[PDB]
Each structure stands twice: as structure tokens, then as C-alpha cells.
């Protein structure tokens, strides 16, 4: 059986184009917001499995204290 592509149907019919006009809800969407607060903007930075497993549960503002933690990460 031929690998040659052959189309059984070639046109969208006139009626379906009428429908396409009547309802475009399935090709439009809802607004995807960036982080709306500083809190959530920081969560998105230090969020993710990779950051979570590499930083303390109680955050450490000084790198001197931070390396005490990251030191112990094989």
C-alpha cells in the first residue's frame, strides 16, 4: 500500500465555515498573568523542585551562612 498521501476529503464545506464564524471560543483563551505581587514574584523565582532541594527551609540572607547548608549537598 502506497506511502503516497491521498486526501479523501479536500475542502471544509461551506456550512462548517459558517460555524467557525459563529463560535471561536475554543481558539481564544483567558489572560495568563505574570506574578501579581512581590511575594508571588519571589515564589516564582525561588520556586521549582531544583531550587527547593538546594536551599534551606528557613531562608538565609548571608552567603556565609548559606554555604553551611549548600556545603552538605552531594
Amino acid at each position: 500500500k502506497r506511502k503516497l498521501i491521498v486526501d479523501s476529503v479536500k475542502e471544509l464545506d461551506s456550512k462548517t465555515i459558517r460555524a467557525q464564524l459563529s463560535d471561536y471560543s475554543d481558539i481564544v483563551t483567558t489572560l495568563d498573568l505574570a506574578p501579581p505581587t512581590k511575594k508571588l514574584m519571589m515564589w516564582k523565582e525561588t520556586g521549582g523542585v531544583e531550587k527547593l532541594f538546594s536551599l534551606p527551609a528557613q531562608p538565609l540572607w548571608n552567603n556565609r551562612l548559606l554555604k553551611l547548608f549548600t556545603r552538605c549537598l552531594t
Binding site: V6, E11, L12, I27, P35, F53, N62, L65, C72
Partner: protein, 896 residues
Amino acid sequence: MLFEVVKMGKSAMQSVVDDWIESYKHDRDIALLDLINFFIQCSGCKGVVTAEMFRHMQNSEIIRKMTEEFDEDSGDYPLTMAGPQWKKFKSSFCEFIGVLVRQCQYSIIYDEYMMDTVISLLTGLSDSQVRAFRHTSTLAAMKLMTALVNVALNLSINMDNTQRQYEAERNNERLELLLQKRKELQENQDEIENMMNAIFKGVFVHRYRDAIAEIRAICIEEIGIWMKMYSDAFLNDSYLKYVGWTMHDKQGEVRLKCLTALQGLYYNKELNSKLELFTSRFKDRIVSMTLDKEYDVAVQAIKLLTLVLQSSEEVLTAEDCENVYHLVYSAHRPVAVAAGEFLYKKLFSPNANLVKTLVFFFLESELHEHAAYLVDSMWDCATELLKDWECMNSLLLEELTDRQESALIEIMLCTIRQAAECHPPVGRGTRVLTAKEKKTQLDDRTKITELFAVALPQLLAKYSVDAEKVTNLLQLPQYFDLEIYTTGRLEKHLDALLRQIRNIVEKHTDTDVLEACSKTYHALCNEEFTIFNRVDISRSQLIDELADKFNRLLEDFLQEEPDEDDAYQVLSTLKRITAFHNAHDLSKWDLFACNYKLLKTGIENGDMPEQIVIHALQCTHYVILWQLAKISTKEDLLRLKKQMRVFCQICQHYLTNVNTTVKEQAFTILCDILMIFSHQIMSDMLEPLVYTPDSSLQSELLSFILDHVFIEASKIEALHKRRNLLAAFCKLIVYTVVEMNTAADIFKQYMKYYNDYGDIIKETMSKTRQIDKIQCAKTLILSLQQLFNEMIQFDRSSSTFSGIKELARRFALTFTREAIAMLHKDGIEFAFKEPNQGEPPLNLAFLDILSEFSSKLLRQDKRTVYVYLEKFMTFQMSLRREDVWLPLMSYRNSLL
């Protein structure tokens, strides 16, 4: 050979056309046949049309014959294959068609032979079900027609000139010549309008609505081209309507072409009344497309709307522009920026009133309560206004409603930050910065520093009473070059700053305000800038004051039963201290004594304000960590462990504290310390320091996780806390501070809590796989075992049961096969672990679960497993087939 010559890309196209025209003049028939073959062979067809076929067969039977001898080996064809060889071919192919027509436009085109043949064929091939024909001929036909529109255009121009010539001669024999010419040109136009109508009604009308989206795009592309190139003949309703409909096409690429087509009818040229009625009919659908599911489309929808704005601002309503303004806060920078340029033109088209305009906009925005994303969206088009810090500064200082003041402070902060660190906010990134961009950076930082070294102290002075404002202003020094404090002769302003900071620290109790102060004082205490000492001295002096107010407060506090007011006093001062101890060394103040006495006095009485406990627990954590930093005595070394081990005890007591946020505070600190003093310390021998939790503590920590992390407004905040706790425990697992067996209670939750915790659990599984291929697979089963026993509160294959089996499939997908051997081993041992009365052994149904894991074996190992199974199953077990024994049959067939 024509196909080949265009494929090879060897020569320029005008020379290939010209050679073809030569031969067409020599012998029409050979040349037309070679041309036919070209169009067929460009479709990937290996057949050839012979002279015999040409003279005799009609196109219908030629196409049929050429479908027969297409001789394809894949479903591919030149216009779909990828790589540059072919991207080039496509463009070469279309160049050849355009050039061929234009070269023929004065003569050959108007014979009855050449064009009619070509058009009738392309119309035929464009009707084929063979996609390679339909697609290739449609591209060819579309290009051909575009070429005719150009001939059509030249024609009308030649007509106008001839017509003007004719009228001028209204005064001999020349006149009859012009009349003749005029007429011949007119014949020529009608002939061209025919060919066009043939192609348009025979091809475009059908192919723009083709089942294949690539084909619909091809069509809409050229129709856009025609209306832009010859708008007087094509830019009207009768052609625009196809573009109007196709704007509703269910495929992104097709919708994108519709928008590109329209943009071409505004930029650079305006203005058409035809176009603006169309645009008015479809305005609603266009603004709706600014939220197209595909974002590439939504960008062009905004950009088109921006273009619309120019020619006329009244087609769009209030609500329309508002819907576009919303997109400045979009997650995706391209729509964000595009919407930003829309906003700019709408409302920002010396700087003061524009700065006030941005403030009003931001304040009327109910989507973001900070400015980082608004500013980033505007960064490209209003970079002059946004970096005008001197204007912004003057508005806050020199004689405006406090809400606007708050807002303007924020925007200023953001512009400063985006100019300082030279990257967009989180979620807006894509650099490794160019030459000129870090020149601008250095420029920006200097201007910021010079202005705000002086300005910030007055800014704090003015606004120190306002918590939110101050937190914002305090972020500033983190953004400027500090060499400029001395080389710039500015040290008196620095002292003003440190004074304003210290007054804030002392009168404020808000966590975020104090956090801001501490973090800034840490930015300034950088001992590679000469200023360190000046600022260090004020740090020393500030904390000297804090500790001493703390001690005095602690004397009266800990004996006289203190009420809510005494507590608020303690608390406040303790918060000021804890904040600073986080960022700063503070070792010189033996502060452990005060916090330990405050903590141990806490456990004994049980009525100690959560907040006082919490910050004390935090504070001690920082005292202990700070000693561990500077390690150099060997009694300092054992004194540390005295404090450390006792602090882990206090934490463990507070882990059962009735107060929930105290529990969680203790837990997180605990998970931190255990990780820090986990004997992964060694890199130098700090061997004494190691801490290993007794199994008592390990079970305490797991109970917490099961009670507080696993249990089913703004609850996303609550989820954040929970994930944080979970990862805090899973770090103990994957760095083996705790036995991997604990992960059993966690792995079983993978499907049940997949959206809250899925990825943290999944990372835990894999990080345990690289650490131990087999005991990971052992714990996977103990998980499935625990689920099984839980179900036992022995009679249905149910929704519950289907659950454990599904989870079993997901575990199976990870597993070389020494581990899976160990897995099937322990699964069998658990299946036959308990006996029945009137025998199948209890737990036998577990084989139906275990059967999920047998795919990932090999027949060698499968029978090794079978040999291990026969050590459990007996001959008459192998023979009592039904009922209630199918788990054993199915597990056995699973192997055989």
C-alpha cells in the same frame, strides 16, 4: 532538467527563464512539455509526461497516469521536506514562476497557447486528492496569479499614459494609431482578467478552505499580497471577505496569515475607506484575538490594533483599549511588550506629566499590585521616561496624594532595578550581555548612585512613617556602585543614610521593614569598599543598643507575671534583633543565653506568645549557625555542640506545641540543622560536630509530615508553606540523614497528591534511584504494601484497588534488572507472608499489583523469578484455577 536546474540552485532564475523562452520561440511544443514536467516533478513525482501523452491525453488522464507512476517511497514531497536545500528550492521555485510570467508579459502571454495550457494543468492538479499535487500546484497557481496582478498593473498604467496621450491630441494620423493602441491594450486587459478569473475561481475559491492548513495559509498569504500590491483593483469587500472568514480558522498559522495580510494594508500606507468598513465589521473579532490561544497570533493582533489606532482612533471603544491594556501584565513578554507599545501610543503620545500618567495607569490597574511587569513591558518604548530618575525624584520631594506617592516610589524602584541588574523580571527572560548594553548599565548605575546617595536620606526622612514606602526605598542601595561613595566625596550623605536607617529599625515592628534594613546594612558592610569601616561602626553601635534594651527588658519579663503589653515590648525588640542576626554576625553578643532562657522558660509555663517563641527559635538558629561559620579554638568547637544538641531538643519539644505555626517553625529549623550538621560536613575534620537523629526524632518528623503536609480564598499561600515543609523532609531522605524506608509513606502519595506534591515526590524518587538502584525499588514496594494493608479496612477488586494498580504501573516505568529482581522478590514474600480458612493465602491479591512490574524483566530473570515463586507455590496451588486464584494465574502467565 528544469526541475533539476531549480533544485540544484546552481544558476540565477532570469537566465533559466530566458533559456526557456528561447526554446519556446524555437519550438513551442517541446518547451511547453518541459514546463509541464517541471510542475509535476516539483511535486516529487518521478513520472514523466511524453510527447505522445501531451498531444493526445487530456489533463485528467495525465494526472491519473502520473499518480500511478509517482514512484514514491515515503509520503514526503519537496514542499514539506526540511533543511536549507529545500527552503531554497521553494523560494527558487516561486521565483521561477514570477519571473517567467513577467518576462512573457508583453507577447508570449497573449498567445493562446502557453498560459492556457499552464493554467488548465494547475487547475487540474489543484483538484487532485494526491496532496503533493494539490499543494504544489496551489503554490504555483498562487504565485502565477500574483505575477498576473503585476502584469495587470503595468497594463493599467500603460493605458492611463496612452489615454492621456490620446486626449492631448484633440486639436491626425497619430490619433488613429493611439485609438488602435488604446483598443489593443483593452483587449490585453480583458485577456488578463480572464486568466485571473480562471485561477481565482478554479483554484483560490476551493483551496483557501482546503482540509490541509498549510494550503489555506498559502492562499490567504497571496490574497493579502494582491490587495497590497494593486489595492485599486483588489482591496475591496469582494476579496477582503475571504480574509474575514479565515480569521476564524481553527488553525493558528492560518489565523496568523490573516493578521499579517491586514497589517500590510496599514503599514506603511493609509488610508482606505473600504478597508475601514471591513475593519469595523471585524473589530470585535480582532480585539478578541489579542487573547488568541496561540501567542504568536495574539502579538500580531495587538500590532494590527496599534496600526488601526493611527489611521483612526475611533473604531476602538473604551472597553477595547482596556482589554488591550490588561495585556501589559501578561505572562508572555512578546504580547506584553506589544500591548505596551499600544498603551504608549494611546496615552503617552518635560517628562513629569508622563510620569504622572504612568502612575495613574498603574493605580487604575486591578491586576498587579507592584510595577515590575508593567515597567518591563514599557522598557523598550519608553526607555527615556523610565530612566528619568531625576524627574521622578523631584516629584516625591519638592512641592502628590499619598497613594500616588506610594505607587510612584514602587515604579521608581522597578525602573532602578531593571536598569541596575540588566535583565527582565522572572518569567520575562529568554542575556549574556552585549558590549553596548553593559556600557549603558555602568552609565545607569552611576547616575542612580550619584542621585540617590544624596536623595535617599531625604526620601527616608520624609516617608519613614510609612511601612510599605520605606521597605521599597530601602531596596535602593543594593543597586548602586559603592566606590562612588568615596571617590565621589559623598561620605556625609552615607552617615545621613545610616542615621535614617537606624531610626527606622528602632520605631518599626513590621517584619518586612526590618528585613529590608538588615539586608541593606549588609550590602553596605562590604569590606572591599573603603566605606566598610564607617558603616561597620554604626552597625556595631546599633546592635550595641538593641542587645542592651533586650537584656533590660528580659529582667523584668522573667519572674512579676507580665501581661500583653510587656510581651509586645519584648517581642518588638526581639524582632529587631533576629532580623539583623540573620544577615549579620552578632557573635560578640552572647545572645544564646537570652534566647535559651526565653525558650526553656517557654516550655515550662506553656503561655508564651507564638511570635516570641517563633523569633526566638529563629534567633537561636542564627546564633548557632554563626559560630559554626568561624571554625580557631577547640573549646569554641565543643561549646557549639553544647548549644546545638540542646537546641535540637527544644525544637523537638516545640514540635508538639499546640500552636500550628510554632510547630512548623520548629520543624523547618530542625530540618535545616539536621542537614547542616549531617556528616556530609566533610570536604576538613569537623567530626565531633556531626548529629544523627535518634529513631525517636525521625518518627516525630514523619508524623508531622503526615499530619500537616498530607491532608485533603488564597490557599495557594498555604500550599507554598506545605511544599516547603515537604521538600525540607525529602532533602533529609535524599542526602540520607534519614532511612529511605520513611520515603515509603511519601511515595504512596504520588498519585493521590499529584498536583500539590507530584514533582517534589518524583524528584525524591529519582534522587533515591541514583543513590541506590535497589533499595529505591524495595521502598517502592513497601509503599504499595502499605497501600494494600490500608485497603484491608479482603473482598473487592475496586476503585481503591484499581488505584494501587495504576500507581503500580507508574512505578514500573522506572524499573539493571537486579533491582526489579529484588522488587518481585519482596512482593512475592509479602503475598505469601500470611496464611489462610479453607485454601488462597491472605495477601494473594497483591500479585495482581505485582504483575504490573513483570514487563520490565527478561525471560532469563523471569524464570529466575519463577524459580523463586515455586519456593512458595505448590502443585495443587498451580491446579486450583478458579475462583479467587486468578491473581496467581495472571502473575504466572505474566512470566511465562
